[PDB]
């Protein structure tokens, strides 16, 4: 037995804390590094000597995706030669080494390592459609930081942590643990909230210290190094005296893993088996659909939030309170809602809560934005305007999708990898979480920009986003529903 109120409030045995608290620390370190790196790259590329920030979009398009595929191929290669632990260390140490060499060797030696300006005539030797490659190669080290800062969350959190969790957690145990790991994300959000503001405060020396980004960057980067080394120590501890405890991983199944399976294929062989598996393309669709929908339902919503609040002081107050309650709602949903929905209803319900909600409360949102004029005769007789009503309804879909990401979406999705063979639990996971996720947060910007030129104005593409969302949610719901048939079947094969 487990209990009556505890089987619903805290479904963790007291002995199986030694497996989950180290994973909480791992998630904490990863998310802390990710938040610090994001907020230091978006703050470091504003203040290069001269216009060293204009070459952000050239990076965003020409390096971010391409370097994501390069990392993905290199990871696929190293998965065949290195062990699981060796691969984890060999992916993590380059990040920490770059974060150590940046403030010591790389950033201070800007004017010496950036193109000896001689790569200035090289601008006008190449066709006038690759001026960015000159700007990218001119802001060379800053380019290496934006890629390694964007990739960190895609690499460490999605591929490395979850790929480690999905290798060391059973499905029934996943239903109880995976929802909880975003509490580490929220606690790391508090830690980063203190750390980043500490760095910004210490950015004060103007005269005796002329370099503003010397000391602050060195301390932020050393903080990321300390967090990454604590990450690696957590990995070592959980591999040395967690996967070795006989309580879990019953004795004879232990040496089935230190003597276990491993990705054994070739680069084109592996990326032709993954491209012709209906399972992986469905996971790719979920991540692509989630990437665009959450971005589209957020740019559509953070356009009414700008019409309702045309002054940043209260927009910061609403988004200061929204960012505070998306932490409270996403500590209760993680502790209480997420693990319970997946255990009393099933896998499918957990994967369909957030798209159905985004659908139902997105239908309401778009019906109050498209039909704004012929709705302020009824809504106006209830004490509110349809703009405020779309703000609140759109906040619910942005507080039941951001508070559902780690709890039900990232739980059910990374649970889906568990019954898989190694070639997609490791190498397909790279494509889904590093490459097939880049098209998510970039495909929502392309759809926005591609429709900001077909409609011209942001207010005219709302009827076109709605049909786009209704199709992506359609392909999301069918992908989630068709995936459930494969998951519940492939899971059944694991009881051989």
């Amino acid at each position, epitope marked *: 037995p487990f209990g009556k109120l505890r089987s619903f409030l805290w479904p963790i045995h007291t002995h199986e804390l030694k497996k989950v608290l180290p994973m909480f620390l791992m998630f904490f370190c990863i998310t802390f590094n990710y938040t610090v790196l994001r907020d230091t790259k978006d703050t470091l590329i504003v203040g290069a000597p001269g216009s060293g920030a204009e070459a952000i979009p050239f990076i965003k398009f020409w390096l971010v995706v391409p370097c994501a595929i390069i990392f993905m191929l290199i990871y696929a290669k190293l998965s065949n030669i290195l062990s699981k632990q060796a691969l984890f260390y060999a992916v993590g140490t380059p990040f920490l080494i770059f974060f150590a060499l940046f403030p010591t060797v790389i950033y201070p030696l800007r004017d010496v390592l950036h193109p000896t300006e001689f790569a200035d005539r090289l601008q006008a030797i190449l066709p006038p459609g690759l001026l960015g490659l000159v700007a990218i190669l001119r802001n060379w080290t800053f380019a290496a930081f934006y890629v390694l800062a964007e990739l960190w969350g895609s690499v460490m959190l999605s591929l490395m942590f979850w790929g480690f969790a999905n290798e060391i957690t059973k499905i029934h145990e996943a239903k109880r643990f995976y929802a909880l790991f975003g509490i580490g994300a929220n606690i790391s959000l508090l830690a980063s909230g203190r750390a980043i503001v500490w760095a910004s405060k210490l950015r004060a020396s103007v005269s005796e210290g002329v370099d503003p980004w010397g000391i602050s960057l060195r301390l932020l980067m050393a903080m990321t190094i300390v967090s990454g080394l604590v990450l690696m120590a957590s990995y070592w501890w959980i591999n040395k005296n967690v996967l070795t405890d006989p309580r879990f991983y019953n004795p004879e199944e232990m040496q089935k893993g230190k003597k276990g399976a491993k990705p054994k294929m070739n680069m084109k062989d592996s990326f032709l088996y993954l491209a012709r598996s209906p399972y992986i393309l469905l996971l790719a669709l979920l991540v692509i659909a989630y990437g665009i929908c959450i971005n589209l339902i957020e740019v559509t919503w953070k356009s009414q939030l700008k019409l309702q609040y045309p002054n940043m002081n209260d927009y910061s107050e609403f988004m200061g309170n929204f960012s505070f309650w998306t932490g409270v709602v996403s500590v209760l949903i993680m502790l209480f809602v997420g693990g319970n929905v997946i255990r009393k209803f099933g896998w499918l319900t957990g994967a369909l809560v957030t798209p159905v909600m985004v659908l139902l409360t997105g239908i309401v949102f778009f019906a109050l934005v498209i039909f704004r*004029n*012929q709705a*302020s*005769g*009824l809504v*106006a*007789m*209830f*004490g509110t*305007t349809p703009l405020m009503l779309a703000v609140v309804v759109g906040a619910i879909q942005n507080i039941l999708s951001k508070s559902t990401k780690y709890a039900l979406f990232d739980s059910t999705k990374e649970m889906a990898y568990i019954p898989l063979d190694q070639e997609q639990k490791v190498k397909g996971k790279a494509a889904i979480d590093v490459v097939a996720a880049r098209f998510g947060k970039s495909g929502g910007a392309l759809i926005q920009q591609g429709l900001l030129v077909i409609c011209g104005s942001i207010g005219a593409m709302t009827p076109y986003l709605a049909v786009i969302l209704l199709f992506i949610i359609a392909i999301w719901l069918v992908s989630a529903t068709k995936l459930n048939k494969l998951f519940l079947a492939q899971s059944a094969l694991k009881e051989q």
Partner: nanobody
Framework: EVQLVESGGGLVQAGGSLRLSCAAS????????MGWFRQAPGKEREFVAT????????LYADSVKGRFTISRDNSKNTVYLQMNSLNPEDTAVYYC???????????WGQGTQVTVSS
């Protein structure tokens, strides 16, 4: 039965004023949600003012903010509407409105003609 007798209509110069009225009978005015719409000939109907169950919440349309002030008195049961600084596009049939405490539709009114001249 639930008739809403309007009043106050007439011709007034630009920058003038006229004050509507909506006699309410057939329900509990103290717990009935009031308002005022308007429908110019040719264009659809838009809401112009709104007053809550207890006179506290006053929601207006962005085209009549500051100029029009809705006010209701439960004793002398009427959802008044004080219009000031009238501009020519306020020419319409200013419908009264009424909603019960848990109903989702509105008992409309006959309609008062407010032609603001130029």
């Amino acid at each position: 039965e639930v008739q809403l007798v309007e009043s106050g209509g007439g011709l007034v110069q630009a920058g003038g004023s006229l004050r509507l009225s909506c006699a309410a009978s057939g329900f509990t005015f103290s717990d009935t949600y009031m308002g005022w719409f308007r429908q110019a000939p040719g264009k659809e109907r838009e809401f112009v003012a709104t007053i809550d169950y207890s006179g506290g919440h006053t929601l207006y349309a962005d085209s009549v903010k500051g100029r029009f002030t809705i006010s209701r008195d439960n004793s002398k049961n009427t959802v008044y509407l004080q219009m000031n600084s009238l501009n020519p596009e306020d020419t319409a049939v200013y419908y009264c409105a009424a909603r019960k405490r848990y109903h989702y539709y509105s008992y409309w009114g006959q309609g008062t003609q407010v032609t603001v001249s130029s």
